[PDB]
């Protein structure tokens, strides 16, 4: 029941600073080797920073002198304090419990850091209404938001089977768009209400959109 829970990511301007946190359970951060590992979109795993049980720290060349790994014994938490951020720092950042100085044996869930000077923007949400031209398919078009990610649920998590939420595509505007679709029994349309719940944390936007036949 080791757990590592990450927070702190999101949008930050180039040149800015940002602090990531990793709250541990099941073991003591202070008595353990722990690391931060990042993964740029579409690329492999790159170790960024390690702290030994005894407090020694080490850094990748690309971050030495501007990132600091640290720990709070009191809160059993690991931190990564980042500075002078640049677009090449955009990545998912993972914290990990290492087994000694050897391998990474428990990982946090990851947190996306997006380094960009563009403003946040929450999405518009449009119905993809089921008709005869869609077993019946219906969905929600989630258009023109920045940065990633959005999360989409259906009927507040009650509806999971048959849902496909597509990867976001970058439009030429510089804003993202995706669709989330679900297939449901045709008999249901009259009776069952279908609501997509669209949450965009970077903009503190939550939109609920009812999808019904036209």
């Amino acid at each position: 029941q080791v757990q590592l829970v990450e927070s702190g990511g999101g949008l930050i301007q180039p040149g800015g600073s940002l602090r990531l946190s990793c709250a541990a359970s099941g073991f003591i951060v202070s008595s353990n080797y722990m690391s931060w590992v990042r993964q740029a979109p579409g690329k492999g795993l790159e170790w960024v920073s390690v702290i030994y049980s005894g407090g020694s720290t080490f850094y990748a060349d690309s971050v030495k002198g501007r990132f600091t790994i640290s720990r709070d014994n009191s809160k059993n938490t690991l931190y990564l304090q980042m500075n002078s951020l640049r677009a090449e720092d955009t990545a998912v950042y993972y914290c990990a419990r290492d087994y000694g100085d050897y391998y990474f044996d428990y990982w946090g869930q990851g947190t996306l850091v997006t380094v960009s000077s563009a403003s946040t923007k929450g999405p518009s949400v449009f119905p993809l209404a089921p008709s005869s031209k869609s077993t019946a398919a219906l969905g929600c078009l989630v258009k023109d938001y920045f940065p990633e990610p959005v999360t989409v649920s259906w009927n507040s998590g009650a509806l999971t089977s048959g849902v496909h939420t597509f990867p976001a595509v970058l439009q030429s505007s510089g804003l993202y768009s995706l669709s989330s679709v679900v297939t449901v029994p045709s008999s249901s349309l009259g009776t069952q209400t279908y609501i997509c719940n669209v949450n965009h944390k970077p903009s503190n936007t939550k939109v609920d959109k009812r999808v019904e036949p036209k």
């Binding site: 209404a129 258009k143 768009s177």
Partner: protein
């Protein structure tokens, strides 16, 4: 620096087949100090194997590791549909610790043709000046599919974007969305909107269409 070269770069096999992944090191890796990780799409990596051959606690028995020196092997004895992922090796016989570049494992299944659905733009979107028409290809295999848009039988170019899901963990299919983006004024000048789909599971291409206003 020990460079780890993984092969093959991509591997596509059916459930029940044996999968063999290789990791070769530019120099000897001491004491069998090599680990393997599985990264499913959108998730954190998880440790599979440490010390070349030791299965980590809780990992299914179909995963095993072997090797020494400069050649290490991760085997999946009998693939399961949930085993699509990128698999990474990592050495800790020398400093700096390094990862391989990954092997992507894809799960093959028998040919499945897409069901095709089409969704007109919603009246709410038209109010704001743009029109998105969405074509959905649901639950098909293999991934490769061609989608062509016709407006009043005129082939469209440059105004559509596609997105494909990750493989379904149960049934190993894909789904695909194609979105045609038009100005409101352009959408209202034309009547027939059509998505034409070519896929090897279809005997002949399939056209799904609607008339604006119906």
């Amino acid at each position: 620096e020990i460079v780890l070269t993984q092969s093959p770069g991509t591997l596509s096999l059916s459930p029940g087949e044996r999968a063999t992944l290789s990791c070769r090191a530019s120099q000897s890796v001491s004491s069998s100090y090599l680990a393997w990780y599985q990264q499913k799409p959108g998730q954190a990596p998880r440790l599979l194997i440490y010390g070349a051959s030791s299965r980590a606690t809780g990992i299914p028995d179909r995963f095993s590791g072997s090797g020494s020196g400069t050649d290490f092997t991760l085997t999946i004895s009998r693939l399961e549909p949930e085993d699509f992922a990128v698999y990474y090796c990592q050495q800790y016989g020398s400093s700096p610790r390094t990862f391989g570049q990954g092997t992507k494992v894809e799960i093959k299944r028998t040919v499945a043709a897409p069901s095709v659905f089409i969704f007109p733009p919603s009246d709410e979107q038209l109010k704001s000046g743009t029109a998105s028409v969405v074509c959905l290809l649901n639950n098909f295999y293999p991934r490769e599919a061609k989608v062509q848009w016709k407006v009043d039988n005129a082939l469209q170019s440059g105004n559509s974007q596609e997105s494909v899901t990750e493989q379904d963990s149960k049934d190993s299919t894909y789904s695909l969305s194609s979105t045609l983006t038009l100005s409101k004024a352009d959408y209202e000048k034309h009547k027939v909107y059509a998505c034409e789909v070519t896929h090897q599971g279809l005997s002949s291409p399939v056209t799904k269409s609607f008339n604006r206003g119906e």
